[PDB]
Design an enzyme around this catalytic site. Structure first.
Site, PDB file in Angstrom:
ATOM      1  N   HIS A  41      34.339  48.202  40.832  1.00 31.80           N
ATOM      2  CA  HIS A  41      35.619  48.234  41.525  1.00 31.80           C
ATOM      3  C   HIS A  41      36.780  48.757  40.639  1.00 31.80           C
ATOM      4  CE1 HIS A  41      38.439  44.924  40.532  1.00 31.80           C
ATOM      5  NE2 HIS A  41      37.371  44.293  40.033  1.00 31.80           N
ATOM      6  N   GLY A 143      42.877  40.261  35.895  1.00 31.35           N
ATOM      7  CA  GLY A 143      42.586  40.948  34.650  1.00 31.35           C
ATOM      8  C   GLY A 143      41.327  40.433  33.974  1.00 31.35           C
ATOM      9  N   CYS A 145      38.326  40.408  35.321  1.00 31.71           N
ATOM     10  CA  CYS A 145      37.161  41.118  35.862  1.00 31.71           C
ATOM     11  C   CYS A 145      36.384  41.759  34.738  1.00 31.71           C
ATOM     12  CB  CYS A 145      37.583  42.164  36.890  1.00 31.71           C
ATOM     13  SG  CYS A 145      38.214  41.493  38.451  1.00 31.71           S
TER      14      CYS A 145
END
Ligand SMILES: O=C1C[C@]2(CCOc3ccc(Cl)cc32)C(=O)N1c1cncc2ccccc12
Ligand SMILES: O=C1C[C@]2(CCOc3ccc(Cl)cc32)C(=O)N1c1cncc2ccccc12
Ligand SMILES: [Cl-]
Lengths: 305, 302
Positions: A41, A143, A145
């Site tokens: 993503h 943040g 991820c």
């Protein structure tokens, strides 16, 4: 003496965290040998995330569109490919701090350490378990991820989780290191909800054995039960069914304390029907289910890595 | 979202752990630059722990009596000295993995990460707080002596604790990195006991603010209190007195949530009175006191 939610030393994993930037998105990556693994993503925008076509989005991108940063050094991307929900960026430099590693898929109830990172920089480490509903009750902000979950067996690091998103209830969803999600989740901004969770019965039993080993016996009783009768009781209190495999796994703890697994099951049954009555077990008023039998044996013995 | 007992990444500390052996005793050491710091009880034998004379025991030792091991490599001891309850062994090699560091002495209520080690090899990492009675509720077994506590604020490692012993109640005692014990303890095997412990009031308040930041308000009420009235109620539940310094420290959390510290104190007063009645705060049925105001801001804001 003492019992804490203990994590594996994060050092081997810290030397792998990089920052990955594509367009306006910035998240974390795992740099092992000459590849950086990160959530796919990272290529998505605002319009794209509504209904994303990752093959269509990725085919537009060139190698220089991905900025990978390892500390103050920039890594140059020389190739890219997608594996399920993870993006694999081929870089020109192999990580000199690459440890001995394996990619493993864990089952619900199993535990792991999480190295929480922001901008490719690790901020903290904590211990947690894959819930039966396939979510993790973690501590993550925007943040985070690309943060990874792992276990360290002897000297080998077993990567088992890569963080992807947070669900409306505050719980977290991610994939294994091959991009396959844990749970019926998708990497898209859409109405998704965690299913009704249950308690990890085998882990609560392991934690009761840990309390006995540390000098807590008030909850023990003279009674025993059958596995069939215990499961009928546990089903009423939203506990996972206890199988013969769970009984066999608790074997060494049963022998070390002298308390049969079905004998310990009769103690758990009384705690479910009557509660703690103002008392605590290992400094807790709730029945802890995030320590496996293996975690109990490793902490009440002193195993090093 | 989410709130966990989070430890600092241990990597910078892992590169400092060595194994120290003198005679039959084996414990952990901290190798920073060309010095290895370890508990001075590494020189004690069986009939020594009751009434040891460390100056008389140390004067009988030479450099080659201390075997220091860094992984598979043996470090050569070229000097030694004692600083309070810590032994400082000068070695011929500076640690190439020495991080940016400071030695800090912490106060009761303050938190830190612990890297538990056995035979100079780290086994685990957990978070914990210096209790008001100066002990730590840690997880340690025989061989964990010399394990260290630390905070990593920015890129600098602040060493604040070195493990020495376990008390009869299961709690742990140690020193700062200059060998001064935390608490009225001695590195003797004499009858010693931890004083009556109390709850860290400022930390429970910080944790209540963390619950409000994560969306939980059921425990809030329409009442307020004075600091003196709150302290009279808290002292009955074995809570540490809350000082004006604690109120000032909770300032940013009070402004971020819009709830005055004395209004949050009235919620705690009520919580102590009523209990939780089947409810939990941040997934806990007990009032958590091992997260400081700084830990809450770090984990909820950055
Ligand atoms: O950083 C991101 C990207 C995001 C944002 C929402 O839209 C999506 C949709 C799909 C995916 Cl795969 C990821 C995201 C997400 O959940 N997180 C977070 C991840 N963990 C915790 C978080 C807490 C607070 C806000 C964000 C958080
Ligand atoms: O390894 C040691 C040395 C010892 C042994 C007892 O006599 C003394 C006396 C003084 C001093 Cl400074 C240290 C010790 C000690 O407490 N520990 C431990 C330390 N932490 C936890 C432990 C748990 C179980 C057994 C031992 C433990
Ligand atoms: Cl302090």
């Amino acid at each position: 003496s003492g019992f804490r939610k203990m994590a594996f030393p994060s050092g081997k994993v810290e030397g792998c965290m990089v920052q990955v930037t594509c367009g306006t998105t910035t998240l974390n990556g795992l740099w092992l040998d000459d590849v950086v693994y990160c959530p796919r993503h990272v290529i998505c925008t605002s319009e794209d995330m509504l209904n994303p076509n990752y093959e269509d989005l990725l085919i537009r991108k060139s190698n220089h569109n991905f900025l990978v940063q390892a500390g103050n050094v920039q890594l140059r991307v020389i190739g890219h490919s997608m594996q399920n929900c993870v993006l694999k960026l081929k870089v020109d430099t192999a990580n000199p701090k690459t440890p001995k590693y394996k990619f493993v898929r864990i089952q619900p109830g199993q535990t792991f350490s999480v190295l929480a990172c922001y901008n490719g920089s690790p901020s903290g480490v904590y211990q947690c378990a894959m819930r039966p509903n396939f979510t993790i009750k973690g501590s993550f902000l925007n943040g985070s991820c690309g943060s990874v979950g792992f276990n360290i067996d002897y000297d080998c690091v077993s990567f088992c989780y890569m963080h992807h998103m947070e669900l409306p209830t505050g719980v977290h969803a991610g994939t294994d290191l091959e991009g396959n999600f844990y749970g019926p989740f998708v990497d898209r901004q859409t109405a998704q909800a965690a299913g009704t969770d249950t308690t990890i019965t085998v882990n609560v039993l392991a934690w009761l054995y840990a309390a006995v080993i540390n000098g807590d016996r008030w909850f023990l009783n003279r009674f025993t039960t059958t596995l069939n009768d215990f499961n009928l009781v546990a089903m009423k209190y939203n506990y996972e069914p206890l199988t013969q495999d769970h009984v066999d796994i608790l074997g060494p703890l049963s022998a070390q304390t002298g308390i049969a697994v079905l004998d310990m099951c009769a103690s758990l049954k009384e705690l479910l029907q009557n509660g703690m009555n103002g008392r605590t077990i290992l400094g807790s008023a709730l029945l802890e289910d995030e320590f496996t039998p293996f975690d109990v044996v490793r902490q009440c013995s002193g195993v090093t890595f």
